[PDB]
RNA sequence: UACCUGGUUGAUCCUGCCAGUAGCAUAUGCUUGUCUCAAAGAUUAAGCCAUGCAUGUCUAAGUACGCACGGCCGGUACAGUGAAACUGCGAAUGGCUCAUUAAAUCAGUUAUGGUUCCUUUGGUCGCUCGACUUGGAUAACUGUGGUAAUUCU
RNA sequence: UGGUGACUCUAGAUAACCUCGGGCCGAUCGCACGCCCGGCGGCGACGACCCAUUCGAACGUCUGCCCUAUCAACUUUCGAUGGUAGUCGCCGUGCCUACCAUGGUGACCACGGGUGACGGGGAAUCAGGGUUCGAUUCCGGAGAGGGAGCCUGAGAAACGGCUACCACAUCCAAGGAAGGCAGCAGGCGCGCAAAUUACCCACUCCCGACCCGGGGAGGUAGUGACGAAAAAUAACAAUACAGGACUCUUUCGAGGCCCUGUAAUUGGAAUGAGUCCACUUUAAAUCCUUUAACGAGGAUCCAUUGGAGGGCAAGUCUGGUGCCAGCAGCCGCGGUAAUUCCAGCUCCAAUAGCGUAUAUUAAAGUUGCUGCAGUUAAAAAGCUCGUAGUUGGAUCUUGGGAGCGGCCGUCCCCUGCUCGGCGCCGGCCCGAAGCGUUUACUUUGAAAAAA
């Protein structure tokens, strides 16, 4: 019984996407996960679910309505080109470095000590 | 400070950008360019706040570095480029063309113009200069040093340049009965016929302007721009037509439009 | 240099004389009658009135056919007509002065839930709202202070997700059903 | 909301202050279930500071002979990924504090016809009448080192 | 030639000069590459003299600041105010020289001193006035332990640059080397008085050669009763009990069609705190929101903090103490009946808050402009003169011409002298720029950052 409407619809020809406001009615039951939103937006606009990036849902008080922002890209390469790399990482097709920034700071400051090729000899 | 400032605080940003309070400490500080800091509207604010093609200022970096944006006939790739008055933003892949004309309130609005209209723009001259070999020079309100102009063109006249070539086609001379967009002060966005010039040796010359509903008002001559000979403008005008309905009449028309529509 | 607001005002004013017998009398009358919880709740309705009243008197110093006074006046009147405190016959701004604290407590959503007969008492009505039973146009209002508009009055009813409406039976009934089945076998 | 009230007397009317009254913003006491905003080493010591971090930066487009990686139609040099180093730019902004400072600072108001201005934007860039690309250093690199010690050389 | 209100402006012409510590006129790089009997060309990147523009910055204009007279004269041949000519400076100028002149400021408060003084936008109180505060997120200024000097650069007298001195302090193999948290954390000290040696460049913007890197700037969490908003701590029946509409009864008593109240009385229905999978949120999380499942009877899931003589809402209740202990902002209570102490019960006030200390605003018409006082309550100089200061008599345009509404009310009028347009046979009617006592006052207009 999950209805999903689209609102304030736009076509960015300059970012190669559709972008719209997803409006999910689901009275009685929990906030529905993004996977059910993507799969319903997919068959709503007759597109692959892989090009659909869906985020920023804040459920109204009472909870028979959530409003989030969606966008449907033209291709897979267009998705991976001009999308925030963190929102790719919800789909597993961006992985970032394990290091926390304090190691990278202290590394940089240790490399500032030695001159020449010996800066590679700070770590390992 | 002991050199130039490179940041603009969100609160200290000009009111006509209509930037919100709560999103960020900083506003986009306009890069140096043709228009003044507090008289321009950066590309970023046009591209992500007015038109909402972006969401963030990193999306605006992706749009502009695809070279899809073309301000007054040349592609810029600066998100904080000062796009100001009478400038023509041509977003070419969408097939759209926008003129930065002041709405009846002091903001710049989303005024869509036709691809034919988007080929020329109108420029107020700031001074007449005589160059290094008797060469006459104009300087426009957007820093265009146009050399060998028509000798009848004087300061406070407007000239119609063609973007592609950068050469003058026509010009309105600053004379009474000519249309006037007000581009500074309390009357920012008014359109009316110039009815009186009032000279002041030393001090600032003031100019009375009658409107399309007989609403006469004054303005400093610095803050004036002529947009057509007599009563016919050389640009397309936004709704309101710089006539400036009062807040009582604004309330009336907004209420009439809401109740009648449903 | 942080990107925060800091903007905040008080909604009440504590009275000058703290132990006026006649004031303690009349404010406890208002609390008991309209089922409020503290003197701050009366003092804030009194302060909303005093703001409206101060604005109205400021407009009465200005001459008639003053465009500020006409615009600001008509706006303040329309605001009072909307919330259902001032009648449409009485939208002249010298009738705002002839206006009392009781008329704003009448528009309190606790007192409207009572007077629309979907609560038994004024104290029951607060329980229902505070236990998110009622809705105003498919919007569950949890908070009894909701000033109900004249536009928005007849759309007050029970929430679809509440057992006093067409909702799932509550925690007590469902335990008493499990007790009734546990006892038998 | 344009408000007072207790106290000199045996009692009275006064002057008149003390004390009550309500905020507000610092401290502190006791108490504290939910939820939304949010101040927070200013006052005293612009006192002293261990340690870590806070300004760095590469595009097709200044400089690539580190095999650190790496393709094959190579002899008409240089595929491409590129650490380091040179070069350019930034480091004069941001942040912090309120010691100094009383026509100073600052505010409104003008002036710059009395000046400077990286950057940006638009001009100018065969306007002068007289080599089909020049010179030799230096750094990374390689290799000998010194001092207890430094982002030393 | 062009321009301003005004140039010793811009441009023009002549004569020359050209800093060897030296203005420009390209020995630079990348894309796609073609046409032409080797030449010629597109699209850029970078660099550059000069001009304009932008971002500014600097120095000036007018006006505006707290207390102080137990600060009345100050400034001046180590510049004080001017003039002339230089030096220096980016330029203007005692900025600095040299030579002249003797000026400049002051009771309209100069000069000196104080400030628990960075200034402003602003904040708190506030009837009308005012009073107080503003270290603090925006603007402007200043400083980086104290002074000082300078390098580089467009921009610094830079301190996350350098060089000294003074102060304090760190390694040391005793020869030396290194320092600057009024950056973010954090430590000590100081105190009445103030949080994590957290996460992140995802948002906001900034910097760079840059779609890609970096940012304790910033964002996000932690501590957080500074303060502000919303808002639980129960609700509803039926029984015990007490009053009333209403009938009856003189009063009792009954009926309850109608309640209204409270009993560790019974009863079901409720929901949130809390626990907690799952989503959502997010850079990754958290909190909220959404949601399964649990989760309330002395609903022990237990509301406090101050008071109960008056001012000031609320016990002349009981026990203890006996001018003791103590309470008490004030008046006062305490000496054996304490409505005032210390307690029990009860009640009052505000309530997730409430008391106390202290600065401060109103109250204070107890600083008085609004607006106070001065015979006797504190207060008019012993008296007069007197210069600033303050305040100053009367008197100089009035009666009309014209129209609308039903004698009255609003409206139009009581200065002249280059060029044009309602035009007419050099003039007249009309418009435009200029000339036309000085202000104060009032009215309008321009302009004045946001928050």
Swiss-Prot record, chain B:
Keywords: Acetylation, Cytoplasm, Isopeptide bond, Nucleus, Ribonucleoprotein, Ribosomal protein, RNA-binding, rRNA-binding, Ubl conjugation
GO biological process: translation
Claim: Membrane is one of the keywords in the record: no
InterPro entries membership: KOW, Rib_uL2_dom2, Ribosomal_eS4, Ribosomal_eS4_C, Ribosomal_eS4_central_region, Ribosomal_eS4_central_sf, Ribosomal_eS4_KOW, Ribosomal_eS4_N
N6-acetyllysine modification, residue list: 232
GO molecular function, one term: structural constituent of ribosome
CDD domains cross-referenced by the UniProt entry: KOW_RPS4, S4
Cross-link (Glycyl lysine isopeptide (Lys-Gly) (interchain with G-Cter in SUMO2)) at residue(s): 229
Domain (S4 RNA-binding) ranges: 41-103
Compartments where found: Cytoplasm; Nucleus, Nucleolus
One Gene Ontology CC term in the entry: cytosolic small ribosomal subunit
Origin superkingdom: Eukaryota
Record-linked SMART domains: S4
Principal cellular location given in the protein's record: cytoplasm
PANTHER family from the UniProt entry: 30S/40S RIBOSOMAL PROTEIN S4, SMALL RIBOSOMAL SUBUNIT PROTEIN ES4
Subunit (UniProt): Component of the small ribosomal subunit. Part of the small subunit (SSU) processome, composed of more than 70 proteins and the RNA chaperone small nucleolar RNA (snoRNA) U3. Identified in a IGF2BP1-dependent mRNP granule complex containing untranslated mRNAs.
UniProt family annotation: Belongs to the eukaryotic ribosomal protein eS4 family.
Job of this protein: Component of the small ribosomal subunit. The ribosome is a large ribonucleoprotein complex responsible for the synthesis of proteins in the cell. Part of the small subunit (SSU) processome, first precursor of the small eukaryotic ribosomal subunit. During the assembly of the SSU processome in the nucleolus, many ribosome biogenesis factors, an RNA chaperone and ribosomal proteins associate with the nascent pre-rRNA and work in concert to generate RNA folding, modifications, rearrangements and cleavage as well as targeted degradation of pre-ribosomal RNA by the RNA exosome.
Protein name as annotated: Small ribosomal subunit protein eS4
Organism: Oryctolagus cuniculus (Rabbit)
Lineage: Eukaryota, Metazoa, Chordata, Craniata, Vertebrata
Curated annotation (Swiss-Prot), chain C:
GO function term, MF aspect, one: rRNA binding
UniProt KW keywords: Acetylation, Cytoplasm, Isopeptide bond, Nucleus, Phosphoprotein, Ribonucleoprotein, Ribosomal protein, RNA-binding, rRNA-binding, Ubl conjugation
Chief location: cytoplasm
Stretches of the chain forming a coiled coil according to its record: none
Residues recorded as bearing Phosphoserine in the entry: 152, 162
Start and end residues of each stretch annotated as Disordered: 161-185
Pfam families, per database record: Ribosomal_S4 (PF00163), S4 (PF01479)
Occurrences of domain S4 RNA-binding (ranges): 107-181
Sites of N6-acetyllysine modification: 65, 115, 154
Subcellular location: Cytoplasm; Nucleus, Nucleolus
Presence of the UniProt keyword Ligase in the record: no
Any Gene Ontology biological process: translation
Record GO cellular component, one term: cytosolic ribosome
Cross-link (Glycyl lysine isopeptide (Lys-Gly) (interchain with G-Cter in SUMO2)): 92, 138
Subunit text: Component of the small ribosomal subunit. Identified in a IGF2BP1-dependent mRNP granule complex containing untranslated mRNAs. Part of the small subunit (SSU) processome, composed of more than 70 proteins and the RNA chaperone small nucleolar RNA (snoRNA) U3.
Cited function: Component of the small ribosomal subunit. The ribosome is a large ribonucleoprotein complex responsible for the synthesis of proteins in the cell. Part of the small subunit (SSU) processome, first precursor of the small eukaryotic ribosomal subunit. During the assembly of the SSU processome in the nucleolus, many ribosome biogenesis factors, an RNA chaperone and ribosomal proteins associate with the nascent pre-rRNA and work in concert to generate RNA folding, modifications, rearrangements and cleavage as well as targeted degradation of pre-ribosomal RNA by the RNA exosome.
Family: Belongs to the universal ribosomal protein uS4 family.
Protein name per UniProt: Small ribosomal subunit protein uS4
Organism, scientific name: Oryctolagus cuniculus (Rabbit)
């Amino acid at each position: 019984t999950v209805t999903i409407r689209t609102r304030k619809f736009m076509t960015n020809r300059l970012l190669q996407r559709k972008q719209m406001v997803i409006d999910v009615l689901h009275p009685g039951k929990a906030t529905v996960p993004k996977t059910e939103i993507r799969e319903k937006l997919a068959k709503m606009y007759k597109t692959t679910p892989d090009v659909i990036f869906v985020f920023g849902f804040r459920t109204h008080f009472g909870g028979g309505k959530t409003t989030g922002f969606g966008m449907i890209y033209d291709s897979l390469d267009y998705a991976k080109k001009n999308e925030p790399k963190h929102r790719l990482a919800r789909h597993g097709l961006y992985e970032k470095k394990k290091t926390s920034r304090k190691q990278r700071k202290e590394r940089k400051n240790r490399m500032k000590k030695v001159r020449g090729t010996a800066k590679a000899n700070v770590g390992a | 400070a002991r050199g130039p400032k490179k940041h603009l605080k969100r609160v200290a940003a000009p009111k006509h950008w209509m930037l919100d309070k709560l999103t960020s400490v900083f506003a986009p500080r306009p890069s140096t360019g043709p228009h003044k800091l507090r008289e321009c509207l950066p590309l970023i604010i046009f591209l992500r706040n007015k038109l909402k093609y972006a969401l963030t200022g990193d999306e605006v970096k992706k749009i502009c570095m695809q070279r899809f944006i073309k301000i007054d006939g040349k592609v810029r790739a600066d998100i904080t480029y000062p796009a100001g008055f009478m400038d023509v933003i041509s977003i070419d892949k969408t097939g759209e063309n926008f003129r930065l004309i002041y709405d009846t309130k002091g903001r710049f609005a989303v005024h869509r113009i036709t691809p034919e209209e988007a080929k020329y723009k109108l420029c107020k001259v700031r001074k007449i200069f005589v160059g290094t070999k008797g060469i006459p020079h104009l300087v426009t309100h957007d820093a265009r040093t146009i050399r060998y102009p028509d000798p009848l063109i004087k300061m406070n006249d407007t000239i119609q340049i063609d973007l592609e070539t950068g050469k003058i086609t026509d010009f309105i001379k600053f004379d009474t009965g000519n249309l006037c967009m007000v581009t500074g002060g309390a009357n920012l966005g008014r359109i009316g016929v110039i009815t009186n010039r009032e000279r002041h040796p030393g001090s600032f010359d003031v100019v009375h302007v009658k409107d399309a509903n007989g609403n006469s008002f004054a303005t400093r001559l610095s803050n004036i721009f002529v947009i057509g000979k007599g009563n016919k403008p050389w640009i397309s005008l936004p709704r309101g037509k710089g006539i400036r309905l009062t807040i009582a009449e604004e309330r009336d028309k907004r209420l009439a439009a809401k109740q009648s529509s449903g | 240099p942080v990107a925060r607001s800091w903007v905040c005002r008080k909604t009440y004013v504590t009275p000058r004389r703290p132990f006026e017998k006649s004031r303690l009398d009349q404010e406890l009358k208002l609390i008991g009658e309209y089922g409020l919880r503290n003197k701050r709740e009366v003092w804030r309705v009194k302060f909303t009135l005093a703001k409206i009243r101060k604005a109205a008197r400021e407009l009465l110093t200005l001459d008639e056919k003053d465009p500020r006074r006409l615009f600001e006046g008509n706006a303040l009147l329309r605001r009072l007509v909307r919330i259902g405190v001032l009648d449409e016959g009485k939208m002249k701004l010298d009738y705002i002065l002839g206006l009392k604290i009781e008329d704003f407590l009448e528009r309190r959503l606790q007192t409207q839930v009572f007077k629309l007969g979907l609560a038994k008492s004024i104290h029951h009505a607060r329980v229902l709202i505070r236990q998110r039973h009622i809705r105003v146009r498919k919007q569950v209002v949890n908070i009894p202070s909701f000033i109900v508009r004249l536009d928005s009055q007849k759309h007050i009813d029970f929430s679809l997700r509440s057992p006093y409406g067409g909702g799932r039976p509550g925690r007590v009934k469902r335990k008493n059903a499990k007790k009734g089945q546990g006892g038998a076998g």
